Amino acid sequence: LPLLNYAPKSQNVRVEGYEIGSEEKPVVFTTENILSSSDMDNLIEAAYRQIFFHAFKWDREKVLESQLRNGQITVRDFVRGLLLSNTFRNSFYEKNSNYRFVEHCVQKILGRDVYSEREKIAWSIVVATKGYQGLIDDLLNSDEYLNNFGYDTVPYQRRRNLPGREAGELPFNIKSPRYDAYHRRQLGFPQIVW
Amino acid sequence: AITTAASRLGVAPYNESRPVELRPDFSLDDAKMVIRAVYRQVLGNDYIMDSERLKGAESLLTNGSISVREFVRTVAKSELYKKKFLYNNFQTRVIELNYKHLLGRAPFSEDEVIFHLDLYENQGFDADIDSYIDSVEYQENFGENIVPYYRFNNQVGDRTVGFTRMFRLYRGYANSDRSQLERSSSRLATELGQNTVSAIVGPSGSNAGWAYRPSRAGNTPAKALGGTVPFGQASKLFRVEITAISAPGYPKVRRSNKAVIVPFEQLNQTLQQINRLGGKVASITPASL
Amino acid sequence: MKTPLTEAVSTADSQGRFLSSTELQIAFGRLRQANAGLQAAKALTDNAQSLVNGAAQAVYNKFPYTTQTQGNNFAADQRGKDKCARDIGYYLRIVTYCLVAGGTGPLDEYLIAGIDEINRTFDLSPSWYVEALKYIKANHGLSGDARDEANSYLDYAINALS
Amino acid sequence: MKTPLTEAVSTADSQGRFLSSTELQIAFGRLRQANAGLQAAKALTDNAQSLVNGAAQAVYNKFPYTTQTQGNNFAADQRGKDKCARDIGYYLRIVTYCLVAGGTGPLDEYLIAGIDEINRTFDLSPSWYVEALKYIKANHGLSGDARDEANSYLDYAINALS
Amino acid sequence: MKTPLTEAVSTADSQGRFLSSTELQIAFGRLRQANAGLQAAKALTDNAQSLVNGAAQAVYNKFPYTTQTQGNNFAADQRGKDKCARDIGYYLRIVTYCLVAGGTGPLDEYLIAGIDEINRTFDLSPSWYVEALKYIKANHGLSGDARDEANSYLDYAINALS
Amino acid sequence: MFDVFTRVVSQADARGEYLSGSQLDALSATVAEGNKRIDSVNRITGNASAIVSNAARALFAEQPQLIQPGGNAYTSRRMAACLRDMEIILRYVTYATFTGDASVLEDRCLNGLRETYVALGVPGASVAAGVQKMKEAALDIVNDPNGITRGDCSAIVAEIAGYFDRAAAAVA
Amino acid sequence: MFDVFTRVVSQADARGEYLSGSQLDALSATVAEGNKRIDSVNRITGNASAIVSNAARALFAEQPQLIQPGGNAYTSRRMAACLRDMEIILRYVTYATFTGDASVLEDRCLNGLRETYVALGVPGASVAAGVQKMKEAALDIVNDPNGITRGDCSAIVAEIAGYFDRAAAAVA
Amino acid sequence: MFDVFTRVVSQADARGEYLSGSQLDALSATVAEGNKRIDSVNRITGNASAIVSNAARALFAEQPQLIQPGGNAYTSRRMAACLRDMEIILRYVTYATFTGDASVLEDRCLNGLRETYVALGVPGASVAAGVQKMKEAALDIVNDPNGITRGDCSAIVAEIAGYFDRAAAAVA
């Protein structure tokens, strides 16, 4: 079935920004720069930060790293590998509803917030119908992903800050921790202290 | 032989040609045909100006004072050959060209580079030229009386790597060794040193992706080490070489040439994306087992 | 291909892990099943001719127009009857493969993926093949684990068609 | 959770599929194992205090400097001995969980994920815990499938620490 | 190259669709327009010298400092006057293309995209070109659909420049 | 998500306790039921298309307003979406039956489903009616005594019925 | 991609020339054929499914090797892929017919197609045979004199034939 | 990838044939070795860290040029990669043992590995030497008569040895 239709909403990413490089421009981590080993570390760390927010040694995917380092795969392939990883499934899929999982995916992969509940609703059914991989591939193959990040750049949160303002929109790793009230209740938190 | 792909590979005209032999008691038209063939073969299909012709060597050939092989030898040792192919080239480039012109094939191994580089360095260009012409291989294929010609077809003594490398040196019929995209650069220095080969990209006109050439660094390896694991559920992997990428523009597009390894299940998406990049498929090759 | 052993390795590899007790238990489950699967495959293989012909007749009985109507998609002529018996033969043979592999892998890869496009393009009713699969289920003669596993694959095909 | 039943469903869900004979076979694998694991968990639990005490003493004996050297990370004082016996108790208890669950799931979720950071941050030697696990392997007195599954988990933790 | 025909196909192709009534109507819309466009292209082509010379002169009159200030970007010497007349010719010629193509495609591909960078790099004022395009609008003599379409392309360039 | 085994472990870990003797024996009892549980999952799965299609037909007969023009299940897309939902819910019910725990059904299928139907205007009570029709069909299929080692499946059937009830209540 | 108009434009631009009076007259003649062009696209499109499935049936009847076990069109997934490829080529041929230029076909259908088929082991000559069958079916549909205003469509039918021939040449 | 079962299935389907009695019998014999196969996988897995580290220590002892400054395994990241590569190979050998088919090892670990090492300057012959050491340690562990139901594992051990030998041969 075709994806349920929904309308956009006004967003920074939807309009021309007249951007000039500053300390608030997301760093472009691309393999098109022929990155040295240490510089490849930073690109890999950036990808872990973008997708996981933090990769403990348990979370890391050393074989995917080697393949990216060797040119076997593109950055987008590395990002897919992270999205397909055990850490991503366990942290962001299993601990959330399909609706919140979609939000995480849109935020992490496309670098923007969702338009509305209806966008979350429309995509929530994709895992069930096309399978988990089908959802990731749709987003990674989307014109929005490719136009912004292509094959060789680590995705990032887009147009978060506007010039001359003290603060931007909330970073997604603050706005969207890996789980929320639903899983918090199951764990029996918050803990009464004192 | 080469039949179905002959035309797109630029081989069909050579399939349609016979070796140019100078028979004993040859006629003058025979001598003219040899002279034309030798100039086209040995000088890599460069245009030859009347002022550049080797009139004396042509006279001696016409008179039977020198055989075909000795005429080839004279052309190869001439200031004309050296100006075209020696004075401006890395010696590995020179060796590539000598092999193409005088033996009609590409070098097989690094050992050939070692031999000819040392011979040039120790005894000079003339000595090196003689080694090609006095070689067993030259004798067996061309002998005294036949102009050298491209040996596309499989022969005794061949190696497969020779076949792929001929299309690094031969770039089509309406083309010369001095009018190719890589210009003066050695085509095979890296292939020989690493004993690797490259996917064959046929000549322009009959192949949209004819211009695909890899960069110095940051290339995609030939084979999919790691298999399908990084791609998730995938049946088989292919290496696609893509050229002429322009549409997004810089900095979204950095290098117009790119090779990607993609799964079978994304080939439809890949071709669609390539088209929208403006790019042209140069080659597709299975990358996994 | 969906089979216990390959799925166990596929999961562990996707997690970059050595095999652990979970995967060993998958292997023990396969071992518990495999002989019954192999025995069922042999039984269906030995009665393939009767099963396929019987199944094809079953369809013809339930859908008489298929043997009376003219058209490329029907079996009123010998050409059509041979296509139909061939097709039912495919369903049966690929089911035996599922019993050998211990999963729907063979059905998924060889027969099911794309079947809807084929039946739509050549105007073949899924209901015909469902009837043939029902006949095989009622006539293969299996029992116990062989029967259960065999019927799952037949019901798997039936469900894919409806 | 790395557990046969959870992964069977996780994989089927990830694939949008109904469960099939492949997943039923995984379940049979689980049932073959489960009683041995439950029996192993009981035996380990009943002997829990002795195993923990023996394991800590094994560590202290192999690494006497841990009971002699002042420092927050060492067991020279009663505080550190209590921490140590607590840590070892965690390993044993979570190992019994893996036997109940039939997979490394509990070890991964509760102990292994992040253990590298803990040991580095608090200057705790992984070799200390490896010694304690080897003691438990040597002294739990299990046999047959119970021994094998229990040793797979103890070795799994040993491998994680080395 | 935005034209009714290519956009209709590209849209359908992006959707993996055969052409349908919607694209056929787009074709009919193109057909209703094309002859008027070709006639407009013919008229402009025949009057090209006068339009270009008058356009350049109208610019010099409105911006007399251009013909009297020394500098690579001005038209004080014959070099600059030739550059200027050439540029205006480009606008006119590419506009006739848009009339032939039936869309802004030729303007977008050949002139508009990147014009901002050109004018900034070489210190050419967009107002100059606006003045020339207004002259061509007022002196091309077209009427009816030929006028409307031609003015739309002339206006399109004017908008891009302002 | 939890299965029957990891549900108990998670509770013990949060308490810092080993499973007790009665907990281990309870899980031993579950294991003794394992073959029946596998049979029930196999039977529902084998009939999934029939359970959905028959339930859908019955629902639209009892509630014709759904399929009248303008009805929520009118138009091909909405009808297909409706059939898809019934199959998804049935599938997640089988998942819960397989693992012996409701978490997979609660977390993946039911969590937030009520609000989604409210947002879309899907009639939640009609869905629950459809789920109850699938429930009745499924239990009969599980309880059928033909072609299976005869025994008492009353416990598993009650467990399965509970899962269908959980789904029906989550949307109505 | 180009269409018949922008093809002329691009050639004119590369020489910095206005379209000559003769070039304009040629395009005006193209405009007069537009209705026939629109009819041909419409008739092919309206019969696309029959064109593909008939041609496919004919191809497999003449080349049973393709569909016997181990043949490149055996298994549903490969059969489906094969039928899809036929429809794709037909679709792009109509695109070329619509625009009056082969660029769309060359750039977006045939770009890398031969390479793909070799890499996959798809028999190119058999694809070309299939394309030829679609061509014959299509041209008969385009030339059908019933239910349409009568005229000479030979100029367009020849153009369409060339687009089919171009596709068949590219897959070999 | 293929396991032992689907390797035979895949071959049969290409020929359009049912598995023969001998093919089914041979697979039955494989099933009878299943317990030994599982035991060997478990034993190698349980000793994986020791197999890798001990082999690496022996390698560097025998080949000090590797770990001299400027050597291929000098610097932490290169030493880490080297240890990683050893572990990757051992892991895939256990995968091949588990499935009873070399395809997983060949496609996911060995394909393209020689070329990578040549391109990087990794001494493939040294890698092979390290693989041999892992082989020796692993086979001894698999053959340990103690703590296991006594029986003949010679055939499985040979199959495992062949997987190691393939790995060593592949890296040059």
Ligand SMILES: *[C@@H](C)[C@H]1/C(=C/c2[nH]c(/C=C3N=C(/C=C4\NC(=O)C(CC)=C4C)C(C)=C\3CCC(=O)O)c(CCC(=O)O)c2C)NC(=O)[C@@H]1C
């Ligand atoms: C309630 C669910 C019904 C019921 C069930 C029931 N089943 C058994 C026993 C078995 N069922 C199986 C199942 C399978 N074997 C296979 O190979 C497959 C495919 C992979 C399946 C699904 C097995 C292995 C057994 C054990 C051996 C046997 O054949 O009995 C029982 C018997 C008691 C037990 O719990 O084992 C029962 C009761 N019986 C009914 O009457 C209900 C309608």
Ligand SMILES: *[C@@H](C)[C@H]1/C(=C/c2[nH]c(/C=C3N=C(/C=C4\NC(=O)C(CC)=C4C)C(C)=C\3CCC(=O)O)c(CCC(=O)O)c2C)NC(=O)[C@@H]1C
């Ligand atoms: C060769 C292609 C065959 C053929 C075609 C043909 N058609 C016309 C004329 C017309 N055809 C159309 C088409 C359409 N009108 C619509 O509304 C739509 C649907 C959206 C379509 C496709 C139209 C508008 C015309 C013009 C009006 C008319 O009724 O004729 C001609 C005549 C030439 C002309 O356009 O004047 C021809 C030749 N005729 C044959 O004999 C071939 C089999």
Ligand SMILES: *[C@@H](C)[C@H]1/C(=C/c2[nH]c(/C=C3N=C(/C=C4\NC(=O)C(CC)=C4C)C(C)=C\3CCC(=O)O)c(CCC(=O)O)c2C)NC(=O)[C@@H]1C
């Ligand atoms: C060569 C590999 C060595 C060897 C192996 C061997 N094992 C068995 C039998 C069994 N091994 C197992 C294994 C496990 N049971 C579990 O629960 C787990 C933990 C998850 C494992 C790894 C089992 C179940 C059996 C069957 C029952 C039994 O206890 O024996 C045999 C006997 C042959 C058989 O196939 O049953 C053998 C030979 N034996 C040696 O001497 C080699 C050193």
Ligand SMILES: *[C@H](C)[C@H]1/C(=C/c2[nH]c(/C=C3N=C(/C=C4\NC(=O)C(CC)=C4C)C(C)=C\3CCC(=O)O)c(CCC(=O)O)c2C)NC(=O)[C@@H]1C
């Ligand atoms: C002009 C008359 C008034 C004015 C405008 C103004 N707007 C912004 C910033 C934004 N405007 C938008 C608008 C949209 N986003 C969408 O998606 C759509 C539909 C496509 C619209 C119309 C957005 C998202 C922004 C923020 C992003 C961006 O500015 O790039 C500003 C800038 C605010 C700032 O702090 O920089 C201004 C100045 N301001 C006035 O004073 C006028 C009354």
Ligand SMILES: *[C@H](C)[C@H]1/C(=C/c2[nH]c(/C=C3N=C(/C=C4\NC(=O)C(CC)=C4C)C(C)=C\3CCC(=O)O)c(CCC(=O)O)c2C)NC(=O)[C@@H]1C
């Ligand atoms: C250790 C015994 C020897 C050694 C190893 C070594 N390898 C590399 C680099 C790479 N190794 C691999 C291998 C794999 N990657 C995969 O994904 C898989 C398949 C699943 C394998 C087998 C790859 C791809 C690389 C390159 C990318 C990467 O850096 O990971 C190095 C590092 C060399 C460098 O830094 O460039 C080393 C040191 N080296 C020795 O000297 C030992 C004999």
Ligand SMILES: *[C@H](C)[C@H]1/C(=C/c2[nH]c(/C=C3N=C(/C=C4\NC(=O)C(CC)=C4C)C(C)=C\3CCC(=O)O)c(CCC(=O)O)c2C)NC(=O)[C@@H]1C
């Ligand atoms: C036969 C099982 C299959 C087959 C073969 C086939 N090959 C060619 C052409 C060539 N084969 C080679 C191979 C080699 N050249 C070498 O130097 C070496 C090692 C020394 C090898 C293995 C080459 C280079 C060619 C082309 C040059 C030549 O043939 O002289 C063809 C003909 C190709 C054509 O006619 O265009 C064929 C048919 N084809 C099948 O379909 C079989 C599966």
Ligand SMILES: *[C@H](C)[C@H]1/C(=C/c2[nH]c(/C=C3N=C(/C=C4\NC(=O)C(CC)=C4C)C(C)=C\3CCC(=O)O)c(CCC(=O)O)c2C)NC(=O)[C@@H]1C
């Ligand atoms: C003249 C209208 C334009 C032009 C031409 C130009 N061409 C070259 C060089 C070569 N032309 C060819 C072409 C062929 N050689 C063949 O054998 C065939 C038939 C099969 C063809 C079509 C080749 C191969 C060359 C290179 C060989 C050589 O000796 O040059 C040049 C020379 C360039 C230079 O010397 O640097 C030129 C000038 N140049 C223009 O400006 C005109 C538009």
Ligand SMILES: *[C@H](C)[C@H]1/C(=C/c2[nH]c(/C=C3N=C(/C=C4\NC(=O)C(CC)=C4C)C(C)=C\3CCC(=O)O)c(CCC(=O)O)c2C)NC(=O)[C@@H]1C
């Ligand atoms: C010496 C200071 C260092 C060194 C050198 C070294 N070089 C090679 C091999 C080659 N060197 C060349 C060089 C040239 N070819 C040319 O055409 C020219 C210009 C005219 C030059 C300078 C080439 C092509 C080769 C390859 C063929 C050959 O081997 O001779 C080697 C051998 C490498 C091998 O693996 O065999 C060496 C040793 N090596 C050092 O360690 C020094 C720092």
Ligand SMILES: *[C@H](C)[C@H]1/C(=C/c2[nH]c(/C=C3N=C(/C=C4\NC(=O)C(CC)=C4C)C(C)=C\3CCC(=O)O)c(CCC(=O)O)c2C)NC(=O)[C@@H]1C
């Ligand atoms: C100007 C002196 C000459 C000239 C330039 C020219 N370049 C392009 C197109 C591209 N140029 C690049 C360049 C780069 N990519 C990189 O990553 C870097 C290094 C960091 C560079 C320098 C690229 C990628 C393109 C293609 C994408 C794009 O167009 O932006 C063109 C246009 C090509 C076209 O066919 O449209 C031109 C004109 N051309 C000349 O004639 C001058 C000699």
Ligand SMILES: *[C@H](C)[C@H]1/C(=C/c2[nH]c(/C=C3N=C(/C=C4\NC(=O)C(CC)=C4C)C(C)=C\3CCC(=O)O)c(CCC(=O)O)c2C)NC(=O)[C@@H]1C
């Ligand atoms: C039998 C129940 C009824 C019937 C059958 C019938 N089928 C076809 C044609 C095809 N059947 C298939 C099916 C498969 N091909 C495969 O590769 C596999 C998976 C391994 C399957 C299941 C296909 C693809 C076709 C079309 C191509 C081909 O013929 O090989 C026909 C002929 C249809 C036509 O138009 O030619 C018929 C007659 N027809 C009845 O009436 C029976 C009740």
Ligand SMILES: *[C@H](C)[C@H]1/C(=C/c2[nH]c(/C=C3N=C(/C=C4\NC(=O)C(CC)=C4C)C(C)=C\3CCC(=O)O)c(CCC(=O)O)c2C)NC(=O)[C@@H]1C
């Ligand atoms: C059928 C008995 C009833 C019915 C259903 C119906 N549902 C929708 C739309 C959606 N249903 C869902 C369902 C889920 N989201 C999840 O995350 C899960 C778990 C995997 C489920 C089951 C979703 C997300 C949608 C919206 C997105 C989409 O439909 O693709 C519709 C269509 C609504 C519309 O406006 O098109 C319908 C018709 N409707 C009835 O009337 C029956 C009572």
Ligand SMILES: *[C@H](C)[C@H]1/C(=C/c2[nH]c(/C=C3N=C(/C=C4\NC(=O)C(CC)=C4C)C(C)=C\3CCC(=O)O)c(CCC(=O)O)c2C)NC(=O)[C@@H]1C
């Ligand atoms: C049918 C007449 C013949 C046939 C076809 C066949 N093709 C494939 C696979 C692919 N076909 C394509 C072609 C395209 N994909 C596109 O998106 C486009 C438009 C740009 C084209 C032209 C591609 C890319 C594939 C591979 C990707 C995919 O998903 O299929 C197959 C399947 C091969 C396989 O499964 O291994 C087949 C069977 N086969 C025949 O025998 C006929 C001659």
Ligand SMILES: *[C@H](C)[C@H]1/C(=C/c2[nH]c(/C=C3N=C(/C=C4\NC(=O)C(CC)=C4C)C(C)=C\3CCC(=O)O)c(CCC(=O)O)c2C)NC(=O)[C@@H]1C
């Ligand atoms: C000294 C404080 C204590 C100590 C040291 C010790 N180290 C090893 C072995 C290794 N040390 C390293 C370290 C490095 N290799 C590098 O390339 C770099 C970065 C440039 C570092 C820091 C490595 C990699 C090894 C292992 C491989 C090798 O042998 O080189 C040993 C031997 C360990 C073994 O098992 O052989 C020892 C003894 N030991 C003490 O007791 C000291 C207090």
